[PDB]
Each structure stands twice: as structure tokens, then as C-alpha cells.
Amino acid sequence: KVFGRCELAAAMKRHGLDNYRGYSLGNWVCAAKFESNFNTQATNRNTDGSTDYGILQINSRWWCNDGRTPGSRNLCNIPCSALLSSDITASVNCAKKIVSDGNGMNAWVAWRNRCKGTDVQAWIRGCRL
Numbered sequence: 393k394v395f396g397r398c399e400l401a402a403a404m405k406r407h408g409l410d411n412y413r414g415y416s417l418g419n420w421v422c423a424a425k426f427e428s429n430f431n432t433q434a435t436n437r438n439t440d441g442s443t444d445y446g447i448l449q450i451n452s453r454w455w456c457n458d459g460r461t462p463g464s465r466n467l468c469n470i471p472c473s474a475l476l477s478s479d480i481t482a483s484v485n486c487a488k489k490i491v492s493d494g495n496g497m498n499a500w501v502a503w504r505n506r507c508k509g510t511d512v513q514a515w516i517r518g519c520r521l
């Protein structure tokens with residue numbers, strides 16, 4: 393599923409991501425835009441052989457099991473395929489664990505490089521929330 397900007401903002405809010413660990417909803421929408429272009433089915437292979445999955449490009453090295461990332465962990469206790477669902481519950485729950493891990497949203501390289509320190513509220517501006 394390819395979410396619209398306000399539609400994703402609404403879903404993220406429903407699943408309790410708005411101000412989670414202090415990150416306003418625009419941070420989450422901005423990160424999703426640059427990680428996946430709002431597409432739940434996005435997958436991208438990394439040089440190390442791990443793969444990133446879903447709307448927030450969660451990586452198989454640490455967070456989910458895809459059967460093909462040697463030495464990896466599955467700290468969200470889910471198959472990486474669960475992260476590609478049209479329903480974002482699994483992605484949200486896993487992102488809550490990731491952003492709690494110590495480095496906040498810096499875990500998401502696209503957030504650090506394209507969202508951090510910008511006007512992230514623009515990503516939610518205009519939305520009925």
C-alpha cells in the first residue's frame with residue numbers, strides 16, 4: 393500500500409507514534425517519506441547482505457528475521473515480511489523498540505540526513521488529525 397501523507401499521519405497517530413519518545417508526528421511522517429516514499433512494500437538490500445523492510449525500512453541485521461541475514465538478531469520477534477503489510481501495526485511496534493534503543497531517531501539514516509533539524513511539522517500541515 394502506498395499511503396498518502398495525511399493518511400499515514402493519521403494511522404501513525406492511531407498507533408501511538410505521535411510524540412513517542414518525544415518525537416512529534418512530523419518526524420515520523422518525514423522519516424517514512426524518505427525511507428519508503430510511503431510504500432509499505434518497499435524493500436532495499438544493504439551491502440552487508442541485510443535488507444530493510446517496509447514504510448520505515450527496518451533492518452534484518454537486528455530487528456526482524458528474513459532467513460538470509462547471517463549472524464543477525466530478530467529483536468522485534470517478527471518475520472520481516474510482517475513489516476510489508478498494508479496495516480502498519482508491526483512496523484510501528486518495531487519502530488517503538490528501535491527509537492528506544494539509545495540513539496533515538498538517528499537509527500534512521502534518512503531521518504538524520506533529511507529530516508533532523510528541518511521543518512518537520514510541514515509533513516503534517518493541513519491534515520485533519
Ligand SMILES: [Cl-]
Pocket residue numbers: 397
Ligand atoms: Cl507527499
Ligand SMILES: [Cl-]
Pocket residue numbers: 416417418419512513514516
Ligand atoms: Cl511535527
Ligand SMILES: [Cl-]
Pocket residue numbers: 457458459460461462463464
Ligand atoms: Cl537470518
Ligand SMILES: [Cl-]
Pocket residue numbers: 457470471472
Ligand atoms: Cl520468522
Ligand SMILES: [Cl-]
Pocket residue numbers: 413414495496497
Ligand atoms: Cl532522543
Ligand code: NA
Pocket residue numbers: 452453454455456457458461464465466
Ligand atoms: Na534478522
